[PDB]
Amino acid sequence: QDSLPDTKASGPAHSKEVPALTAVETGATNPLAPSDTVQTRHVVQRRSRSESTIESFFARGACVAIIEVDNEQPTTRAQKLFAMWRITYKDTVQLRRKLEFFTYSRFDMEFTFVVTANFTNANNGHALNQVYQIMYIPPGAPTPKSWDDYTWQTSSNPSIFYTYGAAPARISVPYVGLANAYSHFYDGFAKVPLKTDANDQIGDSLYSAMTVDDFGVLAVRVVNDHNPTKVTSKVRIYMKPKHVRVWCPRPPRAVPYYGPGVDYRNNLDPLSEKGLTTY
Amino acid sequence: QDSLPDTKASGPAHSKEVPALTAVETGATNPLAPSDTVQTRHVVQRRSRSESTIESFFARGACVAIIEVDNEQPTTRAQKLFAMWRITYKDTVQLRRKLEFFTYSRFDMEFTFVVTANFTNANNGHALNQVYQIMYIPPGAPTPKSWDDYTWQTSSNPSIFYTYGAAPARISVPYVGLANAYSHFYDGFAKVPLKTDANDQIGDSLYSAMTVDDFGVLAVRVVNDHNPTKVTSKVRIYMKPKHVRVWCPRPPRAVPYYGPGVDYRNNLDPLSEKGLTTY
Amino acid sequence: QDSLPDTKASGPAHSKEVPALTAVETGATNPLAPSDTVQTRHVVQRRSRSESTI
Amino acid sequence: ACGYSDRVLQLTLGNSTITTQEAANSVVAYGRWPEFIRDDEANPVDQPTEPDVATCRFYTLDTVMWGKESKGWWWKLPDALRDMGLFGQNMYYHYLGRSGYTVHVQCNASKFHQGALGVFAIPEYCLAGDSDKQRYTSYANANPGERGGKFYSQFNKDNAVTSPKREFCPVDYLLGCGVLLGNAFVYPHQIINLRTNNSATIVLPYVNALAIDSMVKHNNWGIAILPLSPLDFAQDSSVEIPITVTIAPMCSEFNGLRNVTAPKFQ
Amino acid sequence: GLPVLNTPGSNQYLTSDNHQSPCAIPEFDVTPPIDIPGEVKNMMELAEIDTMIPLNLESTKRNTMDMYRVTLSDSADLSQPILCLSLSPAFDPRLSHTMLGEVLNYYTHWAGSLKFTFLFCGSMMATGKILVAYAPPGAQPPTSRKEAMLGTHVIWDLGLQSSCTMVVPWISNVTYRQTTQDSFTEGGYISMFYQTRIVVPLSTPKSMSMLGFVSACNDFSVRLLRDTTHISQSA
Amino acid sequence: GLPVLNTPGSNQYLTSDNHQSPCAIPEFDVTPPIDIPGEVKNMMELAEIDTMIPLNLEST
Amino acid sequence: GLPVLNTPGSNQYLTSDNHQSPCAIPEFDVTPPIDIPGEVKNMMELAEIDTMIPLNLEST
Amino acid sequence: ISEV
Amino acid sequence: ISEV
Amino acid sequence: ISEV
Amino acid sequence: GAQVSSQKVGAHENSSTINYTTINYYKDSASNAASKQDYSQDPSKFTEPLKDVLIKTAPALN
Amino acid sequence: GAQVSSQKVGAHENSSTINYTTINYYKDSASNAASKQDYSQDPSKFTEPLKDVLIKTAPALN
Amino acid sequence: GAQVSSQKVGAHENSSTINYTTINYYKDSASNAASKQDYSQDPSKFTEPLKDVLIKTAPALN
Ligand SMILES: CCCCCCCCCCCCC/C=C/[C@@H](O)[C@H](N)CO
Ligand SMILES: CCCCCCCCCCCCC/C=C/[C@@H](O)[C@H](N)CO
Ligand SMILES: *C(=O)CCCCCCCCCCCCC
Ligand SMILES: *C(=O)CCCCCCCCCCCCC
Ligand SMILES: *C(=O)CCCCCCCCCCCCC
């Protein structure tokens, strides 16, 4: 049973009960129903709010990153034989804005990985099917300096080895926060400048940032040695919050995002023009 | 129920019970809790040690070998048409160091095999999908002298035939030790020189080594006959101990490994510089 | 339950039972155990022949 | 009331007794007292010999001197006792042998001397070699007998690649084996801190991955004594005081009798 | 033919998965266990054993037996700290290589109380009182005894019980701190000062070592397994 | 070898599906919740709070 | 469409595995056994029969 | 099983 | 089912 | 089945 | 360990409570799917967070 | 042969003991997954391996 | 038709009779896997096939 309340039949009124008048100064919304101000009939209501529960509002994989990684001969220049992405939902805007209807959240996270590849050169032979390693490096673990150094041994970090052409890879992660909920907004600093500090750099930190490394990084590489032709791949990462609880609602973002904080810069004019008396 | 103990509330003390003083000469660690030296409040403790059980500390596939094998025309020179790897966890360092927190262990072993291939030459046509045979050769069984001699008939040795592009192959092995636990450290020799020996070579053996062939070898080959273009593959082997018991803890390795024994050679200076009174 | 038989403890002997002598001419193998020719201790045997079944 | 203290102990085994009036209690390694092989853990089937009081008694090794520049000493068991009375004879006449031990380390000084020795009992104490060749220490050099060996402050690589010494080169802060000395406290141990005690007593069960093994090929325990804090006295620069190690086999049993093993040490 | 539909994740290999696989040597006669002394059930058991702290990592002392010795003497400047250290048990160079620091470096987060035990190795004729303190973070790191004594502290009287334990209570905003250094999850400061001074009679050494030990209390745990920076391998 | 037959849909990824997947950090000790004020159970709760209308969207 | 997820090991062939497979000649009328003398149940039964040792492997 |  |  |  | 629940049926075939079955295959609850059988609550903590909540027929300011 | 156990739930959906099911498919126990329902023990054999273990409030050397 | 049997456990996790389950999916018994629960026998038909079998302590030739 999840339907919304029925409309009650109500008739005329001539009385001292005045539900239509109120005082919004108190901070409260007037809980009127149509039968408080008009004559209504009885309606057996069958609509429900099944699709706007917190779980159903977030139950979608949303793209949060596109990581590019190449497989080609290791030259001496800067290449993309492995790539690292600092885990975040703030590199894209659509899931960021839905989470930021709330100040705090607690959820498990499902990651699904879609991998696509293409040739870049008209032809230097071909390539055999590629296997990708996606290694999670938590804050503090050694990060790779080359695509096949010892960190890729992954004895303790979790890795996914994905085979090209297989169904998108997928894993779940528990609520891994250091606090009892994730903070979508943190009004504070990680350091405080003290009067006895030797210089001003010592106590300086970014406004509203918490830890430095946050959740760590995903390091991606193609495990195969290079073919004669170069192959470029992109890994697209989709995040879906599941088993979701959220606290303290907020106005949604109304002007374009400008970085990982709440800063704004342009297009500060979200509303269009409309005459006061134009329908 | 697996949570750690609650903190008990405790107040002031003025007494002859002195938990803060002890004598570490006895060989014992003083079992104090914060309520022995400060006033504490009651805290209902919910943290647990679920992730540092011996099983969870080792429950990761760790890379222990990269075996290279080629498929090309059998020439008269030295080729890699089949490869052999002596089974060990000491060719890499990360899993070796975690096992060596303990002197003895008993576990079953899961092996997962990730196989990647690539072309080496710009083009001499292509290659059809390769099948790989990974044959286990226990100490004493005949070892292959060529990639298709009779030993590959594998009537009694176990083999895996892996098809390129399929999910990584995986098998489990029981506790196969000759003793009641595996020895991660053996302070001894396999032979003793006797006074009546004809020469000194007869009783000479390597310090801390036990059997010669240990667990045997994995022999890997591509089953396909060669294509006109050469194809190189690598088999990466991941070991995960499961159903783990361990005995007699040891200090972890603090300076680089130098071989399969405990020998050291360089970088014998693991600690950095820090002033005695610098925070 | 598939373990092999336990070794029985046995001590000294001075007797007319002579298990060490036999005649292989009969076509039979002498079914001796170590406790027929040496002093043995008791051993609870846990090995099995699981891997050499047909 | 009548006066028992964990500082005053008497140990009696066979025909030998030890007294100490300045102990710091005693350690039973891993909480396990020694014991004989149980029938359900037994493996060789022949009846074992158990010499009992003839071998399970205190043997005192040669005294070593602790001076201001001493870096430490190490012994392996059963090796340090290979020539001790009937324990050595039983060890060499039998293929297999098993034994636990009581180790009593003795070092007295005075109320005006200071210093602290760490006494560690290590299962499978593998030590590092002196050269580029790995696992190359020879049997005679790995097994010094009651003489034991010493630690060094630094890695001195044997360079006579012609007539290699094939010796261990145990560096002290690396516990002779590539780990940091400070973590050796995870092993059963006591400290003889001269202001507090003059002896350390540690009871060692047999520890191995097997119920019984070859005592000639394999040492089960190593004893490492290192100055955690160096010896000092009054204002003299060359104080020396003795350190004596007395060890008793416990629950010794041997299997596989035949002719005697005669190792080549020289 | 049971009708089936393959979901995302099919055919991947996650190195932390937990699945069954065929046994390659079936019906093997496994050697049964024996009761070896010294069995370990949880890695936190190793972090609860006191191991000696390399407190002295000055130039000439680090990586020698002297990194474990802190010199106390009857002529020390009584106003100066004997030692100062940050509570970053997996990161501060004095704590990161203790058995406690080596186990925490395989985990990303830690929480609980810790205890520091100090051993005096002077002669029996030496006496002294020492203040060892812990300042929860957020204020100026103690430079004098006067500031150090306003935080958690123990005043140690040297005597027949040779050693003294100070417990650093878990006092934290977050429920778990990071094992790397981060100001958001910083742990505070340990300092030590003379409360009176070392006093010795004549014919007694005027200098002596103090050794320090650290271990976890029974409320300590770690989580999120990760690789350590303390071992590597070159190509 | 249970005999199986793969149906249409096999190996697709629908972003609104709802399936299980292996946990990448097993046996993690999750921080328990505390009772934070302000919990929301349905997005329609937010549409029931009065918010001020920008009624005057004339030019200036 | 029972939702399924393929694990590592899928599609490999381990020569010591032990699985079912379709019978290629269904409903075949098998010849029943008879009691032949000499049945063996374990290879260790053969190692318990005395066989003669080639003790003299000198040159000639 | 458990119907709900 | 039939356990054995 | 056997719940635990 | 099968959980059986009722589906809320939308379009009906010309054929009642239709059920569906769920079994969790993993030990970690993070691996679980979402059950989407979610309860709701009262908006009052946002719409009427007043110390004296008054009835809508009475004057808001008395 | 299905074993049913409880999951230790971390994050909770706005929907109790959630269970999971396991069946072993192979005869050899080496093929089994890990149950990770692991008990712990007392560190005393390492932290206090003393013949006379004394109480922390009493003097260590008497 | 599920058969449930006990596994003979080799290495034990720090967590008893562990069981495994089998169902035959084919009508022809040749399709079945091997149960490997195999009994053994006495070697006597090979080691002592004598008409008068004598006891090992007695003389073989009387
Ligand atoms: C093999 C792949 C494993 C991938 C493991 C990823 C672990 C990290 C999951 C993080 C989910 C992040 C959600 C966002 C939280 C933030 O809002 C707050 N900054 C936390 O206070
Ligand atoms: C078809 C592939 C089959 C692969 C079969 C592999 C069999 C061998 C498994 C060995 C696991 C080794 C773990 C290490 C043990 C060592 O520590 C000790 N040296 C034993 O005393
Ligand atoms: C409750 O679970 C009672 C038994 C349900 C029987 C059907 C089980 C289907 C297989 C589940 C396997 C999970 C992974 C080993
Ligand atoms: C206990 O096992 C009771 C019955 C469980 C029924 C579901 C079985 C699912 C199939 C298992 C097949 C194993 C390999 C033949
Ligand atoms: C005995 O078999 C009782 C019922 C077991 C129920 C689980 C069956 C799993 C599917 C078997 C299908 C065989 C081929 C149609």
From Swiss-Prot, chains K, L, M:
Lipidation (N-myristoyl glycine): G1
Compartments it resides in: Virion
Residue intervals passing through the bilayer: none
Domain of life of the organism encoding this protein: Viruses
Assembly and oligomerization: Interacts with capsid protein VP1 and capsid protein VP3.
Function: Lies on the inner surface of the capsid shell. After binding to the host receptor, the capsid undergoes conformational changes. Capsid protein VP4 is released, Capsid protein VP1 N-terminus is externalized, and together, they shape a pore in the host membrane through which the viral genome is translocated into the host cell cytoplasm.
Protein name: Capsid protein VP4
Species name: Poliovirus type 3 (strains P3/Leon/37 and P3/Leon 12A[1]B)
Organism classification: Viruses, Riboviria, Orthornavirae, Pisuviricota, Pisoniviricetes
Part of the full-length chain shown: 2 to 69 of 2206
